Amino acid sequence: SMEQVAMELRLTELTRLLRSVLDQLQDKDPARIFAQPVSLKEVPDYLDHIKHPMDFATMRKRLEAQGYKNLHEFEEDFDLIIDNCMKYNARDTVFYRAAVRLRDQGGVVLRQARREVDSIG
Numbered sequence: 558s559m560e561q562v563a564m565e566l567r568l569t570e571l572t573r574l575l576r577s578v579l580d581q582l583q584d585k586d587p588a589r590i591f592a593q594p595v596s597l598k599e600v601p602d603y604l605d606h607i608k609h610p611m612d613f614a615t616m617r618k619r620l621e622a623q624g625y626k627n628l629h630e631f632e633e634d635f636d637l638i639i640d641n642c643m644k645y646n647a648r649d650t651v652f653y654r655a656a657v658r659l660r661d662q663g664g665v666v667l668r669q670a671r672r673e674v675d676s677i678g
């Protein structure tokens with residue numbers, strides 16, 4: 558139907574906007590601490606600690622499969638990256654501090670992203 562095409566056009570547009578948000582957020586991680594899944598080979602007990610792992614590469618895979626239906630779903634996954642890190646790692650580690658910084662700097666980006674999503678529809 559024509560509706561479903563228009564639908565898919567918007568979803569495709571959303572994906573385009575989210576790809577830009579994702580690139581902007583990942584730029585706030587120049588150390589690439591959050592770029593890839595936590596290695597289960599190098600951290601074999603990770604899943605005992607963290608029930609829903611997340612990372613930027615995994616977000617990107619879902620993004621290109623157009624698997625984010627709205628900004629909220631995208632934001633949930635970003636929050637997982639931060640929150641998982643701040644649980645597993647102690648307050649005085651480079652990892653925890655990198656998560657705090659990413660959350661603070663990412664807030665700016667996500668704030669305008671929400672406006673753009675509502676605005677454009």
Ligand SMILES: CCOC(=O)[C@H]1CCc2n[nH]cc2C1
Nearest residue numbers: 590591595641642645646652
């Ligand atoms: C690539 C080196 O960074 C890490 O290992 C940290 C990545 C973020 C994270 N979330 N939970 C545990 C960790 C560990």
